[PDB]
């Protein structure tokens, strides 16, 4: 079913946008089961279905942009502490600095509190493409979200990446 | 909307080396001292609305507080929030992350956000406007971006142009 | 809220504390400034289960109306009527019409010099089809004007001594605004001889025009309390005639 698992994850993608309905009770369920779907198309090791399923993941995003960034931006944010696979959560973490300056000032706060458990558990994973793309979102990410934390914060997360130049 | 705040306007009518070293820069300095001794839009209105409060970049939010100054000064009538006072409400909001600090690009903002506010009290009033103005300059940022901007809209629209207009120039 | 029998109950509850409140006085005025931000330039939308709120808590205090309750804040009250008088709805239209039978039968003193004075509210400041002229204007009175504006869009149509049919404004609608002719007319007896408008209304099409005298015409029209509501207006256009000439 290596043909067939292609068809399957490309046919999801285009009767979201084509709904022209949004904001709905019916819309709302919907767009949370089959989000999480996208990345074990990416997550199955084949260069035919690992490159042509992750262009199809952000066919999504730019559409929605406008409409349900508050609803994309939660689901997203489940799968860096379910700590997945090396590839798995790799191709997510490019999506997440894209969009860090596209939240608001009123949700950002709640926003802060939970990536310091989620962002110190990437540092300690020893794979080196995962810790690659952490240092093209650390750049993106604590820039937007970097006024609206205290001094108590702050100091927890630079003792964690000075035991990674060991 | 750039291109909807013009098309309302055109809607609605609207010398040799001792010259110049010295003779004629030393005589812009005595002349100066004589004188020192002397509808359509509304489906597309209503859609610019909902962009502010979810957007984040700050040049986009800077196009939208002179689409409304336009609306005033051409007396559309205030119908844009027909039954509540959706928009209005959330400007207020913004004032409360600039002092703290929590706004990212506070300063292209600050000089565009106190012009809508004035010119709707012609018709919030200038006694609410002057306190919130207050708040930025002794809590908040520094002043060359903040508090120094934010009074050029108040004092050009209130120094130029009975008992209650008295009280409020001596603050 | 939206039930009738919860809008009557708040509304009597406002009123009877602030004839006990600590100062009888200074509670009155503080009633009157709540209500006319929820009524803040009329030309909005104000969610007409709400107007029908605040028209009601103001029958149960003007009878108490008579820092105290200012000579301007009365003013304010009443121009808010007239285009509440021309808001079409059944529920909406007969709730500003018994607020304005009460405010000229036990009208607040310093409301009641206002309108019978010559230039009036110009003071202060500083199915209709033609020039009534608005309660602004100068060399008339305001009592003259408001029963200029009350008969050509409930009672009267300005061609001819005709009657307006049942079936465009209801005979309860018809019922209080007869009433409301006649308590001004003790106040101010030289409007029910005026002209309807101001600027005659088109020679062309009619071919004379009539006074606010086709009021006396409801006798003959059908059921009781127009009958008996034009028996009354005959009552007190005599009863002020001879009290304002001696």
Redesign the interface.
């Given at each position: 079913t290596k043909k067939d698992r292609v068809n399957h994850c490309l046919t999801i993608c285009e009767n979201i946008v084509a709904q022209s309905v949004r904001n709905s009770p019916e819309f709302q369920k919907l767009l949370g089961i089959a989000m999480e779907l996208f990345l074990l198309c990416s997550d199955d090791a084949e260069s035919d279905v690992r490159m042509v399923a992750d262009e199809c993941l952000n066919k999504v995003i730019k559409a929605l942009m406008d409409s349900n960034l508050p609803r994309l931006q939660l689901e997203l944010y489940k799968e860096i502490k379910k700590n997945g696979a090396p590839r798995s959560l790799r191709a997510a973490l490019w999506r997440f600095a894209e969009l860090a300056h596209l939240v608001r000032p009123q949700k950002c706060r709640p926003y802060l509190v939970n990536l310091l458990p989620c962002l110190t558990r990437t540092s300690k994973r020893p794979e080196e493409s995962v810790q690659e793309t952490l240092a093209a979102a650390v750049p993106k990410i604590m820039a937007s979200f970097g006024n609206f934390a205290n001094d108590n914060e702050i100091k927890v997360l630079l003792k964690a990446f000075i035991a990674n130049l060991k | 909307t750039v291109c909807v705040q013009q098309l309302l306007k055109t809607l609605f009518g609207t010398p040799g080396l001792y010259h110049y070293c010295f003779m004629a820069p030393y005589t812009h300095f005595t002349q100066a001292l004589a004188d020192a001794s002397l509808r359509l839009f509304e489906p597309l209105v209503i859609k610019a609305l909902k962009q502010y409060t979810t957007t984040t970049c700050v040049q986009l939010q800077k196009q939208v507080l002179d689409l409304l100054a336009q609306l005033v000064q051409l007396r559309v009538?205030?119908?844009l929030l027909?039954?509540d006072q959706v928009f209005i409400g959330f400007v207020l909001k913004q004032f409360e992350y600039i002092e703290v600090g929590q706004f990212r690009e506070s300063e292209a903002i600050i000089p565009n956000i106190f012009f809508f506010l004035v010119l709707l009290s012609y018709e919030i009033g200038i006694p609410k406007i002057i306190q919130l103005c207050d708040g930025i300059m002794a809590s908040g940022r520094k002043a060359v971006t903040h508090a120094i901007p934010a009074l050029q809209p108040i004092v050009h629209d209130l120094f130029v142009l009975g008992k209650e207009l008295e009280t409020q120039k001596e603050v | 809220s939206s039930s009738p029998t919860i809008r009557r109950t708040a509304a009597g509850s406002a009123v009877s504390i602030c004839q006990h409140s600590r100062r009888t006085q200074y509670f009155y005025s503080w009633l009157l400034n709540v209500l006319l931000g929820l009524l803040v330039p009329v030309?909005?939308?104000?969610?007409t289960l709400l107007i029908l709120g605040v028209l009601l808590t103001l029958r149960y205090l003007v009878p108490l109306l008579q820092v105290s309750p200012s000579a301007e804040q009365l003013v304010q009250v009443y121009e808010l009527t007239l285009h509440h008088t021309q808001h079409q709805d059944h529920n909406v239209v007969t709730g500003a019409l018994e607020l304005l039978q009460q405010l000229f039968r036990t009208p607040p003193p310093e409301l009641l010099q206002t309108l019978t004075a010559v230039g009036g509210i110009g003071q202060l400041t500083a199915r209709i089809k033609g020039d009534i002229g608005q309660s602004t204007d100068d060399d008339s009175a305001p009592l003259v004007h408001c029963v200029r504006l009350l008969s050509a869009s409930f009672l009267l149509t300005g061609g001819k001594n005709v009657l307006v049919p049942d079936r465009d404004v209801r005979v309860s609608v018809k019922a209080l605004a007869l009433s409301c002719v006649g308590a001004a007319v003790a106040l101010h007896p030289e409007s029910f001889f005026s002209k309807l408008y101001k600027v005659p209304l088109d020679t062309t099409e009619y071919p004379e025009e009539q006074y606010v005298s086709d009021i006396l015409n409801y006798i003959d029209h059908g059921d009781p309390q127009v009958r008996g509501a034009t028996a009354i207006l005959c009552g007190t256009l005599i009863c002020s005639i001879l009290s304002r000439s001696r």
């Open positions: - | 009538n205030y119908c027909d039954s | 030309e909005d939308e104000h969610s």
